[PDB]
Design a protein around this ligand. Structure first.
Ligand SMILES: Nc1nc2c(ncn2[C@@H]2O[C@H](COP(=O)(O)OP(=O)(O)O)[C@@H](O)[C@H]2O)c(=O)[nH]1
Ligand SMILES: Nc1nc2c(ncn2[C@@H]2O[C@H](COP(=O)(O)OP(=O)(O)O)[C@@H](O)[C@H]2O)c(=O)[nH]1
Lengths: 157, 161
């Protein structure tokens, strides 16, 4: 099994991402992917409930084969804090997949004149880090399985 | 595209350097594509900086490993930023690459010296660059002095590897 860690600030949607991926619903865990030819099993750890414990995050990053690092496209601070998480991963570690989650609210946010992190900011930040990038919605399921497959393919190298 | 990172202490003028270079103006991650003519040929640069991330040593190192070259800035009117050049060079040499040492804000040297404030003379900048085998240049993001020239000098050394 490949050990995959979900990290990012509280309230970015880590628990929701896992439930959508594993149980297909919105309100460690095991996940079998078919990646290219092969059956590929993931063991999925998350830092939800424990985000403030740097030592726990760091320990997870040490045992990780790969990291899914979420921010929330509607929460600017969660995107600013990506630097805090990546520094911890670079020190303790591994493929990183940067995920702009909650992409489904962007239209609502935009309509009501509220600020969202544009996707190209995430693409560019991810590029500087040598990280993959993906926008997802744990709510409507969009890109959820695809983000994890893109990470798994990079881990299998 | 050659990958070029700007580094150095906060407030040395990394953003201002990039904005002057890429947009010819002075007023997420700073990230710009820039085409230069180096000798005969078109040469594409992928440029970013460590503004907002200076205190993250693991990220800095990751950036220095990924760079084809570094523009490393200090502020000629701020001695501490110059002394810290030695910390930055250690990280760059530990990580990996051509370095261009840039003494930025050269336009303020007269204002500093008029007001009794200490500045780093270019001779000291050149001497530190020679210690490390780095290129050296003084620049001003504010008035545009030597900004493109610095980058071209680095790009030539990067193409030579
Ligand atoms: N609209 C929307 N809400 C989401 C999404 N993902 C999570 N949420 C909501 O964001 C809040 C925080 O989500 P949660 O999964 O608990 O985040 P965690 O703290 O990172 O584990 C909850 O109210 C979720 O319903 C998403 O993709 N879209
Ligand atoms: N006078 C002068 N000021 C500059 C120059 N470059 C940057 N600054 C100013 O110094 C401050 C820090 O610059 P900034 O680009 O944000 O530096 P950074 O933290 O390294 O990215 C800003 O207020 C700039 O306007 C320069 O060449 N001359």
């Amino acid at each position: 099994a490949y050990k995959i860690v979900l990290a990012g600030d509280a309230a970015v949607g880590k628990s929701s991402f896992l439930m959508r991926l594993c149980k297909n619903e919105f309100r460690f865990q095991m996940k079998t992917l078919i990646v290219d030819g092969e059956r590929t099993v993931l063991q999925l750890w998350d830092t939800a409930g424990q985000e403030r414990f740097r030592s726990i995050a760091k320990s997870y990053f040490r045992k990780a084969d790969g990291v899914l690092l979420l921010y929330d496209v509607t929460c600017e601070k969660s995107f600013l804090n990506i630097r805090e998480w990546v520094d911890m991963i670079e020190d303790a570690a591994v493929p990183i997949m940067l995920v702009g989650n909650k992409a489904d609210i962007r239209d609502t946010a935009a309509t009501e004149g509220q600020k969202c992190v544009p996707g190209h900011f995430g693409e560019k930040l991810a590029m500087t880090y040598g990280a993959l990038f993906c926008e997802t919605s744990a709510k409507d399921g969009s890109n959820i399985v695809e983000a994890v497959l893109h990470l798994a393919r990079e881990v299998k190298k």
